[PDB]
Amino acid sequence: ANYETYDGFKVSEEPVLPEKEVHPSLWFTKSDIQKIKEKKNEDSFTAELWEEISNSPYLTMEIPTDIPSATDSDTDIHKYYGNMSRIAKYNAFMYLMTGKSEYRLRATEALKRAFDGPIYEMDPTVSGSGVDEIYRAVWAQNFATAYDWIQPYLSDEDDEIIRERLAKEAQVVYENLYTWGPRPHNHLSKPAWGLGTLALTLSDHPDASKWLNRALEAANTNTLYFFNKDGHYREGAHYYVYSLVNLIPFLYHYKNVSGVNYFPEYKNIFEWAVKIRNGRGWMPNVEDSWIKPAPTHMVASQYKDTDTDLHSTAKLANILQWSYFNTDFRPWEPDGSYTGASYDDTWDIDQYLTYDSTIEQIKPDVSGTVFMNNSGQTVFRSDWNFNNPNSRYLLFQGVAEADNHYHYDHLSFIIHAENQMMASDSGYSRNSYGEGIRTSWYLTAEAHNVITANGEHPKDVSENTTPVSRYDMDTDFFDFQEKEAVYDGFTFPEKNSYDFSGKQIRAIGFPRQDYFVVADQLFSDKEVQYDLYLHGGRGEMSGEGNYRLWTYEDDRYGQEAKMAAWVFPSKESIFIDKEGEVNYEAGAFNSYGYLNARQIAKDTMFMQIIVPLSKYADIPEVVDLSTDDVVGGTVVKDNEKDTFMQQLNNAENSLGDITTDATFAYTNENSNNELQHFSVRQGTSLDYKGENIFVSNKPITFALDISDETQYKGTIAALNETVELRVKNPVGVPTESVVVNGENIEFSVEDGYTVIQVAEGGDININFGE
Ligand SMILES: C[As](C)(=O)[O-]
Ligand SMILES: [Ca+2]
Ligand SMILES: [Ca+2]
Ligand SMILES: [Mg+2]
Ligand SMILES: [Mn+2]
Structure with missing residues (x-):
C-alpha cells in the first residue's frame, strides 16, 4: 500500500510547549474549577452527566491489591489497567469538585500504581494483547489527566514517583509507536494522541519535545492516508469514533496547554458526520462499521466562529450541536456506550467538560x-x-x-x-x-x-x-x-x-x-x-x-x-x-x-x-418498456406518471412518451397527464408525446421544472464548452429574462423558444411575461 498518495491532510509537527508546567491546564485552569463544579445546574444534560460521574462505582470500588501476572487472561490484564486508570481520573475529578480527602488519597494510590504489573514484560505485537497500544492510549490520557488534576496536592515525594511512572510509559510508547503501529491506521493514531497528552502533561520533562514531535508526525501519517481533506474516514464510522476517543482530548490538550489550535484544520472530520447522517442521526454501516452516532457536541464549542455550507446564516457550532441531540440513542440503551472503549474511557467526564449548554441547536436550512x-x-x-x-x-x-x-x-x-x-x-x-x-x-x-x-x-x-x-x-x-x-x-x-x-x-x-x-x-x-x-x-x-x-x-x-x-x-x-x-x-x-x-x-x-x-x-404500477438499445419504463405513483430511459450511445430513440438522443432521461407528469419536470444526461433534443421540449447544438445535462408558466426553473450540470440551448416557451408567452447563477444572460426568442448561449452550469430561471 502507498500511504503517501491519498488526498488527506496533516498539521504542523513542530512541538510547542509552554515555558513551565501549569496543573491543572489540560482541560481547564485553577480559576475555572468553581464554574465547572456549578456546570451541573445549567440544564438537564449537565445534571444527568453529573448524576453519572458523582455515582461512578470507580469512587467506591476497592483499589485491587491483586496485581495480575503476565500469564493471566488478556481480558483481566486489560480490565486491571482500565480500572486503575479510571480510579485515578474519577477520584482526581471528584477531589477538585468536592474536596473530599478520600478522593485525593484514592487518586494518589492509583497514580503511584500506574503501569505496575506485567505490562512492560508483555508484547503488544501479539494479536489481542491485553496491553495493545489502542487500550494504553486511553490509559495514558486517563492517568495524565488525573495527574494534571491532583499534582498541586501531591507531596514532593509522590510527585517524583508519579512523574517517573508517566515518563516511563511516554518513553516506551515513543520508542515502540512505529513497531506497534507499522501501518498508519487507528493503532498508530490512537497511541500517538496518548503520547501527545503525556508530553503536554510532562511539558518540563527533557524528552517532552521529542515525544510531542513523534506524536504529531505519527498522527499525520494516519490523517494523510485514512482521512480525506473533506473529512471522510476510510476505516468507517466505527473506527472514526474509536479514533475520536483519543483525538478529541488531544485537540483540547494542545490548545489549552500550548495555545496550538488544530480545531480549524480538523473541522471537516466533524462536518463529514453531519453530511452522511441518516434521518435518525446514524452514520452508515459501511466498511468494517456498525451504525454510529457522531459525538459532534464535544467539539461544537470550538466552531462558534466557523462558517458552514450546511446553513445560510448559522455557524457550524449550532449545526454540530443540532446533529448530536437529533440522534436516536435507543440502540445504545441501557449502558449508553457507543465509543468502542467502554472498559477504558471516561466519556461522562469528557462530555461534562466539553458540552456547551449556551449553543442553540439549529437544523441545517x-x-x-x-x-x-x-x-x-x-x-x-x-x-x-x-x-x-x-x-x-x-x-x-x-x-x-x-x-x-x-x-x-x-x-x-x-x-x-x-x-x-x-x-x-x-x-x-x-x-x-x-x-x-x-x-x-x-x-x-x-x-x-x-x-x-x-x-x-x-x-x-x-x-x-x-x-x-x-x-x-x-x-x-x-x-x-x-x-x-x-x-x-x-x-x-x-x-x-x-x-x-x-x-x-x-x-x-x-x-x-x-x-x-x-x-x-x-x-x-x-x-x-x-x-x-x-x-x-x-x-x-x-x-x-x-x-x-x-x-x-x-x-x-x-x-x-x-x-x-x-x-x-x-x-x-x-x-x-x-x-x-x-x-x-x-x-x-x-x-x-x-x-x-x-x-x-x-x-x-x-x-x-x-x-x-x-x-x-399502495404498490406503484411499474411497466418495463426496455427494447434492444433502450432500457427503462414507467412508474405511476400518487396519480403521476414518471418515465425513465437509458441507452449506451447518443442516438435518437423512444421509450413510452419520451423521444431523445440523451443517454439518460427522466420525465414527471401531473394528475392531468401534462409534462411538469424533466432531466437529460448529454441530450441535444427531447420530445414528450411527439412535442419538442428543448434542442441544443451540443450535448447538455440539465433538469427543468416547467410547472410554473411564469418561470421555468432548474439546474445545468458543469459545462466543458459553450452550448446554444433552446427551450420551448408556454405557447404565446414572451421571455422577460434568463438568470444562470444570479446573473442575467443574453437571450433571444425564435419560433416560440428561448435561445441562450450557456458557457457555465448552475441554477437557471427562465422568467416569462403574459
Ligand atoms: C443481456 As443483452 C446485451 O442480450 O440485452
Ligand atoms: Ca469499500
Ligand atoms: Ca434536491
Ligand atoms: Mg499493533
Ligand atoms: Mn459492507
Missing part, C-alpha cells in the same frame, strides 16, 4: 443533497427532519479503497426512509474482525448493492484515486450523479491481471425527492456474466419476476414499512432469490432475502426502480 466528490460519497436527502417517515436518504458510496477494514462496496448505496433502514450494506461482521464469515461474506462484493463482472468487484482505476463523479445536479424535484469504476483496476489484496477489461457507470436519480432510480451502463471488451445484487436490509422478501418487496417490522432500527423494487431489463435477465446476513451492530446478525439479477452480455444496462413505502401504501 440548505438542500439535503450533498456531493463529497473528493472522497466520493454522495447523499441524496429530501430534508434534515429528525425521525420523520416522509424523509428520504440514499448514500452513494464511491470511495478509493484503503488497505485496512475495507469492504468491496464501490458504487453501492443504502436507503433510509419511512423511519426504517431499507436497501442495506451487510455491515461489519456478526461480532468481530477475526470471524471467518467476515472474509467469506460481509466484506465481499456480493454482500453489497453492486454489479460484478465474472464475480470481479467494481474498483479504483488506480490506488488512492477517487472514482470519477459527473453530472451532479440538485433541484427541488430531481437530483442526479453518475460514478465510474473499472473491473480490471486496483484493489486489496492486490490483483494485477484480468481475463477482460470493463467498467460500470452508475447513475442515481431522486425523482420527486420521493424514490430512487439506479441506472447502470456496463462496457466490456468481452462477453461476461453481470450479477446485480439488491439487499433490502432486515425485511421479509416477497415477489416474483423482476419485482421484489421487503416488508419491515417495528425493530431496534426503525418502524414498520416496506421497500418495493423493479429491475429492467425483464426479458434479458434472470432473477435469483438468495439469503444473506445483514447486521447493523455487534451480535444482532440475521439472514434475509436478497435479489440476484443476471445477464450474460458485453455492453449492456440495468435499471432499478426503488420505492420506500409506508406499511399500508
Whole structure:
C-alpha cells in the first residue's frame, strides 16, 4: 500500500510547549474549577452527566491489591489497567469538585500504581494483547489527566514517583509507536494522541519535545492516508469514533496547554458526520462499521466562529450541536456506550467538560443533497427532519479503497426512509474482525448493492484515486450523479491481471425527492456474466419476476414499512432469490432475502426502480418498456406518471412518451397527464408525446421544472464548452429574462423558444411575461 498518495491532510509537527508546567491546564485552569463544579445546574444534560460521574462505582470500588501476572487472561490484564486508570481520573475529578480527602488519597494510590504489573514484560505485537497500544492510549490520557488534576496536592515525594511512572510509559510508547503501529491506521493514531497528552502533561520533562514531535508526525501519517481533506474516514464510522476517543482530548490538550489550535484544520472530520447522517442521526454501516452516532457536541464549542455550507446564516457550532441531540440513542440503551472503549474511557467526564449548554441547536436550512466528490460519497436527502417517515436518504458510496477494514462496496448505496433502514450494506461482521464469515461474506462484493463482472468487484482505476463523479445536479424535484469504476483496476489484496477489461457507470436519480432510480451502463471488451445484487436490509422478501418487496417490522432500527423494487431489463435477465446476513451492530446478525439479477452480455444496462413505502401504501404500477438499445419504463405513483430511459450511445430513440438522443432521461407528469419536470444526461433534443421540449447544438445535462408558466426553473450540470440551448416557451408567452447563477444572460426568442448561449452550469430561471 502507498500511504503517501491519498488526498488527506496533516498539521504542523513542530512541538510547542509552554515555558513551565501549569496543573491543572489540560482541560481547564485553577480559576475555572468553581464554574465547572456549578456546570451541573445549567440544564438537564449537565445534571444527568453529573448524576453519572458523582455515582461512578470507580469512587467506591476497592483499589485491587491483586496485581495480575503476565500469564493471566488478556481480558483481566486489560480490565486491571482500565480500572486503575479510571480510579485515578474519577477520584482526581471528584477531589477538585468536592474536596473530599478520600478522593485525593484514592487518586494518589492509583497514580503511584500506574503501569505496575506485567505490562512492560508483555508484547503488544501479539494479536489481542491485553496491553495493545489502542487500550494504553486511553490509559495514558486517563492517568495524565488525573495527574494534571491532583499534582498541586501531591507531596514532593509522590510527585517524583508519579512523574517517573508517566515518563516511563511516554518513553516506551515513543520508542515502540512505529513497531506497534507499522501501518498508519487507528493503532498508530490512537497511541500517538496518548503520547501527545503525556508530553503536554510532562511539558518540563527533557524528552517532552521529542515525544510531542513523534506524536504529531505519527498522527499525520494516519490523517494523510485514512482521512480525506473533506473529512471522510476510510476505516468507517466505527473506527472514526474509536479514533475520536483519543483525538478529541488531544485537540483540547494542545490548545489549552500550548495555545496550538488544530480545531480549524480538523473541522471537516466533524462536518463529514453531519453530511452522511441518516434521518435518525446514524452514520452508515459501511466498511468494517456498525451504525454510529457522531459525538459532534464535544467539539461544537470550538466552531462558534466557523462558517458552514450546511446553513445560510448559522455557524457550524449550532449545526454540530443540532446533529448530536437529533440522534436516536435507543440502540445504545441501557449502558449508553457507543465509543468502542467502554472498559477504558471516561466519556461522562469528557462530555461534562466539553458540552456547551449556551449553543442553540439549529437544523441545517440548505438542500439535503450533498456531493463529497473528493472522497466520493454522495447523499441524496429530501430534508434534515429528525425521525420523520416522509424523509428520504440514499448514500452513494464511491470511495478509493484503503488497505485496512475495507469492504468491496464501490458504487453501492443504502436507503433510509419511512423511519426504517431499507436497501442495506451487510455491515461489519456478526461480532468481530477475526470471524471467518467476515472474509467469506460481509466484506465481499456480493454482500453489497453492486454489479460484478465474472464475480470481479467494481474498483479504483488506480490506488488512492477517487472514482470519477459527473453530472451532479440538485433541484427541488430531481437530483442526479453518475460514478465510474473499472473491473480490471486496483484493489486489496492486490490483483494485477484480468481475463477482460470493463467498467460500470452508475447513475442515481431522486425523482420527486420521493424514490430512487439506479441506472447502470456496463462496457466490456468481452462477453461476461453481470450479477446485480439488491439487499433490502432486515425485511421479509416477497415477489416474483423482476419485482421484489421487503416488508419491515417495528425493530431496534426503525418502524414498520416496506421497500418495493423493479429491475429492467425483464426479458434479458434472470432473477435469483438468495439469503444473506445483514447486521447493523455487534451480535444482532440475521439472514434475509436478497435479489440476484443476471445477464450474460458485453455492453449492456440495468435499471432499478426503488420505492420506500409506508406499511399500508399502495404498490406503484411499474411497466418495463426496455427494447434492444433502450432500457427503462414507467412508474405511476400518487396519480403521476414518471418515465425513465437509458441507452449506451447518443442516438435518437423512444421509450413510452419520451423521444431523445440523451443517454439518460427522466420525465414527471401531473394528475392531468401534462409534462411538469424533466432531466437529460448529454441530450441535444427531447420530445414528450411527439412535442419538442428543448434542442441544443451540443450535448447538455440539465433538469427543468416547467410547472410554473411564469418561470421555468432548474439546474445545468458543469459545462466543458459553450452550448446554444433552446427551450420551448408556454405557447404565446414572451421571455422577460434568463438568470444562470444570479446573473442575467443574453437571450433571444425564435419560433416560440428561448435561445441562450450557456458557457457555465448552475441554477437557471427562465422568467416569462403574459
Ligand atoms: C443481456 As443483452 C446485451 O442480450 O440485452
Ligand atoms: Ca469499500
Ligand atoms: Ca434536491
Ligand atoms: Mg499493533
Ligand atoms: Mn459492507
